[PDB]
Amino acid sequence: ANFENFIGATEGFSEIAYQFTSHILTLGYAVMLAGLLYFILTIKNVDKKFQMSNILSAVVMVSAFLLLYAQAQNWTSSFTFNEEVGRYFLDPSGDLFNNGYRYLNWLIDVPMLLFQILFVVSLTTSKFSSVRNQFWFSGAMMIITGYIGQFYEVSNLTAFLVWGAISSAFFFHILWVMKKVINEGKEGISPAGQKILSNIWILFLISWTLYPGAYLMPYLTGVDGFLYSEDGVMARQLVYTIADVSSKVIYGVLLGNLAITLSK
Ligand SMILES: *C\C=C(C)/C=C/C=C(C)/C=C/C1=C(C)CCCC1(C)C
């Protein structure tokens, strides 16, 4: 159904590819647990008016920890070692590699990552509810559309790219609203706070952009290329993990540093 199931059923995964993926996916949820503690223990550092950011971050941590731990458990329990060939192949008796776990974490997270910023920075000419509604509708849509096309990653590479194209449309609209929010939030805050808001915008752009990259990591070097193999799966899962810590944990950390900066 997905690229990881196909490669695991045809050429198979080497011992290092399988060992490396389960390791990156373990490090993935382990830092979410660490992030959950950081946000809980640091709430006393920010004034009451900003604590909504810590709360939102902590709930994202929980969602990330639970679902990413299941994604890892699903990966390891999805392949078995064939001593006769020397590689890990799809196990007909297991439940297969399912991306729905990662895609459900995204759906729960988008509304909270985009909402929490509006609890630290202030808008000027924009309306609070107008920005929030645009963030929730388009953030959900980019995800349900990215999940619809992900079903044809193998079955139909045309629908894979069209759905990913529509999903991107909603994605670039978010970057647009996120840019006005950071421009308005900069007004009336000290130069120190502005610098952090600039770092946040840059981290938001790269981190969220990493996702579509992994969505295409295999079909990047062609239909018979270096990444159209077990290496493309190692790079996709790796890219997801980097974007996962950056867009969820690092992003939330920077917001807290901003809130800390604002109370002076
Ligand atoms: C886990 C938390 C968040 C905010 C995840 C965000 C993920 C993306 C922005 C993914 C975007 C996609 C794009 C742009 C196109 C293909 C489908 C994706 C969902 C991977």
Residue numbers in the entry: 8 to 271
From the paper:
Here, we describe a multi-reservoir, high viscosity extruder as a step towards automation of sample delivery at XFELs. After commissioning the device with lysozyme crystals, we collected time-resolved data using crystals of a membrane-bound, light-driven sodium pump. Static data were also collected from the soluble protein tubulin that was soaked with a series of small molecule drugs. In two commissioning beamtimes at the SwissFEL Alvra endstation, we validated the general performance of the multi-reservoir extruder and determined 13 structures overall.
